Amino acid sequence: SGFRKMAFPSGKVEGCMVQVTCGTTTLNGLWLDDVVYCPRHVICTSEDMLNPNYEDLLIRKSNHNFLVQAGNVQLRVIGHSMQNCVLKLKVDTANPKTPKYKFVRIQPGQTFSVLACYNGSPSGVYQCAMRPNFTIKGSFLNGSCGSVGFNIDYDCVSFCYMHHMELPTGVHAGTDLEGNFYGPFVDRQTAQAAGTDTTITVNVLAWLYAAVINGDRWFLNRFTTTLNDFNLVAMKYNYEPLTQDHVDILGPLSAQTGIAVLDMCASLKELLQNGMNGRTILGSALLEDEFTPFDVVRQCSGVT
Amino acid sequence: SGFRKMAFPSGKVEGCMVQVTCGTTTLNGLWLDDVVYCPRHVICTSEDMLNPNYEDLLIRKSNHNFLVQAGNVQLRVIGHSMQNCVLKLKVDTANPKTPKYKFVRIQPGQTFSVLACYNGSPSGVYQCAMRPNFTIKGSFLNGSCGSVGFNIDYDCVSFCYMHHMELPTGVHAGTDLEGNFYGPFVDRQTAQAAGTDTTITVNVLAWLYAAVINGDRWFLNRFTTTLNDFNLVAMKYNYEPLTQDHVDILGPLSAQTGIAVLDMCASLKELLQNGMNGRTILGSALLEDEFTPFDVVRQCSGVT
Numbered sequence: 383s384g385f386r387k388m389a390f391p392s393g394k395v396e397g398c399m400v401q402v403t404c405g406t407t408t409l410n411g412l413w414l415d416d417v418v419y420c421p422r423h424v425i426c427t428s429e430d431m432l433n434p435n436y437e438d439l440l441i442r443k444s445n446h447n448f449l450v451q452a453g454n455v456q457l458r459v460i461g462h463s464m465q466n467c468v469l470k471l472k473v474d475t476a477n478p479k480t481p482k483y484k485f486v487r488i489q490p491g492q493t494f495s496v497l498a499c500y501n502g503s504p505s506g507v508y509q510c511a512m513r514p515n516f517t518i519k520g521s522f523l524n525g526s527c528g529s530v531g532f533n534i535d536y537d538c539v540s541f542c543y544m545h546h547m548e549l550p551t552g553v554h555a556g557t558d559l560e561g562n563f564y565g566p567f568v569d570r571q572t573a574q575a576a577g578t579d580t581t582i583t584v585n586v587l588a589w590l591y592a593a594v595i596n597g598d599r600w601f602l603n604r605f606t607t608t609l610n611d612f613n614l615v616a617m618k619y620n621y622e623p624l625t626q627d628h629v630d631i632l633g634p635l636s637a638q639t640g641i642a643v644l645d646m647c648a649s650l651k652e653l654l655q656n657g658m659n660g661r662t663i664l665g666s667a668l669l670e671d672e673f674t675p676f677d678v679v680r681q682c683s684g685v686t
Numbered sequence: 687s688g689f690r691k692m693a694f695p696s697g698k699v700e701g702c703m704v705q706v707t708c709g710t711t712t713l714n715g716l717w718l719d720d721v722v723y724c725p726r727h728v729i730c731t732s733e734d735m736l737n738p739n740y741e742d743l744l745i746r747k748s749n750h751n752f753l754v755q756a757g758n759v760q761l762r763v764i765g766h767s768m769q770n771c772v773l774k775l776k777v778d779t780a781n782p783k784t785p786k787y788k789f790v791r792i793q794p795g796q797t798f799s800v801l802a803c804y805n806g807s808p809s810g811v812y813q814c815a816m817r818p819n820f821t822i823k824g825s826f827l828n829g830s831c832g833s834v835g836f837n838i839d840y841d842c843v844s845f846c847y848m849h850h851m852e853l854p855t856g857v858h859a860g861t862d863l864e865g866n867f868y869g870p871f872v873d874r875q876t877a878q879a880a881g882t883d884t885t886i887t888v889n890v891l892a893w894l895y896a897a898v899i900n901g902d903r904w905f906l907n908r909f910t911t912t913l914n915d916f917n918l919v920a921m922k923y924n925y926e927p928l929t930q931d932h933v934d935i936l937g938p939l940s941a942q943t944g945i946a947v948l949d950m951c952a953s954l955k956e957l958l959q960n961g962m963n964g965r966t967i968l969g970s971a972l973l974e975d976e977f978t979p980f981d982v983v984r985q986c987s988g989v990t
């Protein structure tokens with residue numbers, strides 16, 4: 383028992399981190415097989431970031447201008463190409479520590495672990511959710527660019543995020559591993575609106591099921607609701623509307639606890655309308671939305 | 687910017703995890719050099735756990751009864767000994783993945799990362815604090831015994847905790863790597879009182895400094911206090927009394943923010959007396975005590 387904001391073990395990803403330097407800019411790269419992936423803004427100076435013409439800036443660079451260092455080992459760059467907002471540096475050596483991996487574009491509301499890195503060296507690991515507005519509320523400083531987000535399915539690492547930038551609001555934006563930004567963002571030093579965010583309803587419900595499994599049950603009530611009624615409350619409180627697809631993925635937790643999904647919605651409705659009354663759920667005084675139903679099942683069943 | 691409950695990268699510890707089976711009990715072991723460390727209750731059956739005589743139970747075991755498997759690789763056990771509540775199984779092969787390491791006994795209030803494991807395989811990583819009452823509020827299921835807690839100082843892993851058991855209250859107890867329990871606990875299936883716990887005051891103050899660094903400043907007020915006055919409030923609210931040693935370790939954060947430690951104590955006093963007023967600090971609606979002053983500096987400076 384107990385429920386923590388647990389990250390995946392980061393070892394498989396640590397073995398892929400390298401430092402990439404181009405000119406006077408150093409950031410992190412991800413070395414998988416014989417390719418190093420990194421944010422394309424490694425080719426910019428500070429003056430370039432106002433409105434970079436990436437195609438023109440990259441034309442001034444040759445393979446030998448990309449310095450890639452895997453801790454101690456220096457990699458020889460034999461090709462370079464830009465794909466969306468990432469650079470792919472072909473190296474002459476396949477990473478001996480390449481885990482089985484996939485590149486995936488996650489949906490908003492899904493969770494993943496981030497291995498925060500600086501100068502190609504891992505600093506720490508944390509779990510977070512991709513917000514419905516496609517930002518992440520990470521912990522990143524200058525030099526963290528190129529740090530990646532990922533999930534693990536037994537021996538396979540699915541990389542879903544590469545960090546690119548911090549918005550003026552202090553939230554983070556980045557791309558999938560094909561260099562496509564999540565959200566409307568562009569890799570430029572310009573103030574950019576992140577959409578209105580919402581709370582990930584299906585994850586709050588999953589976390590309430592995690593609370594019941596772990597013995598925190600005070601919020602369970604004698605009520606039920608309907609999807610329609612619940613969604614009027616969700617709209618008022620800036621929660622994502624709940625759909626039958628969300629009810630379906632909550633099925634395993636409903637079955638494990640014997641609490642019908644709409645009865646848990648009625649508990650969530652009462653918590654939204656009344657607050658927590660100075661009480662806590664799983665050590666939190668707010669409704670937590672960074673655990674998916676899959677995360678709750680994995681954590682509560684001890685999947686390796 | 688941003689502030690997360692960040693764990694150390696777990697790769698160096700993942701390389702040390704093995705599965706240990708003795709009879710019908712399987713748990714995790716830590717393979718460092720040519721020794722595997724694991725909880726001594728691997729030698730018990732369920733009937734034995736009521737009141738085990740560990741010396742007698744271990745006398746019935748020979749080296750060949752301890753099955754140690756490092757994923758695929760089977761280790762040959764050439765010696766066994768019990769040290770306090772841990773078994774040390776000497777194996778004929780030094781772990782090629784042994785990182786530089788130390789065994790340390792941490793103080794209550796200090797933090798560390800836990801690599802939760804099952805059957806010798808890592809499941810997830812999370813950061814937590816050793817409570818002032820020597821329990822940890824972990825996330826552990828049956829089979830997690832032998833999972834370890836650790837900190838990292840550049841290339842050195844300081845192992846501080848090995849997980850042994852879950853108390854009837856759902857909190858966790860374990861030992862240092864010499865097998866000495868933290869707290870009054872014994873490795874027996876008996877209800878055992880954990881002391882009265884308190885909130886780690888110096889860590890709440892460190893986290894308020896982390897909040898100011900990251901832009902959450904609403905709780906800063908026009909007041910100051912004294913150590914004596916603050917400690918009357920700390921006593922009323924079940925917080926650890928603040929000492930000059932705690933003020934001294936908060937010095938770097940006080941210097942970085944320009945907020946004198948006693949002025950931050952006055953903000954904490956007002957938060958204790960008034961609550962959060964439905965507001966949040968670093969995404970939390972309660973006062974967080976799982977970040978030490980060292981953690982805040984490390985996270986806010988990007989140490990690798």
Ligand SMILES: Cc1c(N)cncc1NC(=O)Cc1cccc(Cl)c1
Pocket residue numbers: 423431522523524525526527546547548549568569570571572687
């Ligand atoms: C400074 C920083 C922090 N704190 C966290 N994460 C990232 C950064 N780096 C940047 O945002 C630098 C940058 C500027 C403009 C566009 C792009 Cl793509 C990148």
Ligand SMILES: Cc1c(N)cncc1NC(=O)Cc1cccc(Cl)c1
Pocket residue numbers: 383727735826827828829830831850851852853872873874875876
């Ligand atoms: C069951 C469990 C969980 N959930 C989490 N962590 C650990 C466990 N295992 C136990 O507590 C088994 C045990 C019983 C009595 C004494 C000792 Cl030392 C160990």
